[PDB]
């Protein structure tokens, strides 16, 4: 139904919950199809027990070929599900750090500027960037772990992306000079953010 | 410590909980190695940016080589972890159905057999065989989802494995038929269950 497809998943359901549920639904559906084909294969096999060799091989080629078309569907579906999910996760992570940066800039320009609000907004921005850094490392680590050939294709891009994040954080930290008197009041807490709480981009 | 390795995990930790914990330990461990190398790479990169391309290209290949060794180690380690875990799940499923068969044979052979006991045992048994069947299909649907050539090669084994389960179930139900009055009695419940 087109209207349902327009509305999409409810707001209650997170991307992660919806992903798992769709993965699970395909998995059940595909287990049923595979099981039916396997049963037919078995049933043809039971009648043909004493068949001549080449007749038995033809019976096997018949079902192997059905299974192949099935396997390729299963994997095509999977790619589509996994690409849609990966694209959404990246967008969410991009949104979280950009909205947090927004919060930080709004707090800096407040009048009278409020140290606690600025500090809080900065903690939230630094976490969001760290979430992107960990996602970049973990996805690389995961592809290395289950698909080592795909991993070699990524290295340089991963390497570049981490430098990008690191510079951007430092350029953002630099925006504290927008309110240098708030900068000075916050100096010890900033050392604490970056190194005690380990929110710094080079931790 | 060898003695700790002998004892293995505590009994209160399931194989599943244990497996996820170990996978996550290794994951956090390997992300740090990779971050360490990536940062070394960035510093060498930066330090040598004004140098000749021959000096620079020789540098890139150096860390690429380093990471390739790292990818290999990560991949192999995940293989050993997945092998250990698959081997243990198959043993658990084996043990549950064999233990359940034992119960069904005992109750069946009791003097005299009692329909409530048999039928509880037969139910526990069937569930156990259904569990191995689900596992066999799900594993295969998963290799199909992820690795095409490996699915092509296990295809016939899975077929064979499913037939074996089916033959065991039929044989076990046929033992019930040895007692026609007990078989006919439980059969309505069984047929409900067998197609449940
Ligand atoms: O023994 C008893 O407990 C009791 O026995 C009697 O007293 C009673 O029975 S009776 O009345 O006498 O007949 C009864 O009270 C009880 O038995 C029955 O109830 C219990 C309790 O459940 S319930 O509350 O009633 O619902 C049942 O046991 C509990 O639930 C099962 C269950 O599967 O539902 C188990 O749940 C956990 O463990 C399983 C298996 O363990 S393990 O093999 O992993 O070590 C987990 O499934 C596996 O992992 C998932 C997974 O990771 O997602 C799946 O893996 C595949 O998919 C993933 C992708 O997913 S994801 O994106 O990563 O999330 C992929 O990465 C994997 O590679 C892929 N594997 S595959 O392709 O090779 O297949 C698969 O489902 C499993 O993978 S596998 O290892 O390869 O097979 C499951 O996820 C996990 N659930 S949990 O929520 O995370 O905890 C537990 O055994 C148990 O949980 S509990 O908390 O300890 O209670 C019992 O089954 C039932 N017996 S029965 O009804 O008679 O049959
Ligand atoms: O390689 C594949 O293509 C692949 C696809 C399939 O999904 C699956 O195949 S199958 O199962 O074999 O069939 C495999 O999935 C991989 C997955 O691709 C990979 N992602 S990665 O980016 O390459 O590293 C990895 O996934 C784990 C990641 O940590 C993360 O993925 S992410 O979507 O890219 O970010 C995601 O993390 C989930 C948490 O698991 C979830 N926690 S839960 O408790 O609610 O279940 C939640 O965490 C929140 C939450 O608010 C709270 O967590 S809690 O622990 O305290 O409860 C905390 O605040 O942290 C939050 C958070 O971490 O964000 O959501 C996150 C992220 O949300 S998101 O999914 O929307 O992005 O999933 C992890 C996971 O283990 O699933 O590993 C997968 C499986 O590992 S594998 O089997 O070894 O390959 O392969
Ligand atoms: Zn510092």
Residue numbers in the entry:
A (entry chain A): 292 to 494
B (entry chain B): 292 to 487
Q: What do the study's own words say?
A:
APP and its paralogues APP-like protein 1 (APLP1) and APP-like protein 2 (APLP2) contain the highly conserved heparan sulfate (HS) binding domain E2, which effects various (patho)physiological functions. The ectodomains of all APP-family proteins share the N-terminal E1 domain and the central E2 domain.
Refinement was performed to a resolution of 2.5 Å and resulted in good stereochemistry. In contrast to the apo form, the short N-terminal α-helix αA (Asp292–Phe298) is well defined in the electron-density map in this trigonal crystal form of the complex. The co-crystal structure contained an (APLP1 E2)2–(heparin)2 assembly and revealed two different heparin-binding modes of APLP1 E2. The longest heparin stretch of six sugar residues is exclusively associated with one APLP1 E2 protomer (chain b) and extends to a surface patch distant from the centre of the dimer. Only the register of the sugar moieties determines the fit to this surface patch, which thus seems to be compatible with the binding of continuous heparin chains in various sulfation states. Our structural data rather suggest specificity of APLP1 E2 for nonreducing ends of heparin and HS exposing terminal Δ4UAp2S and IdoAp2S, respectively.
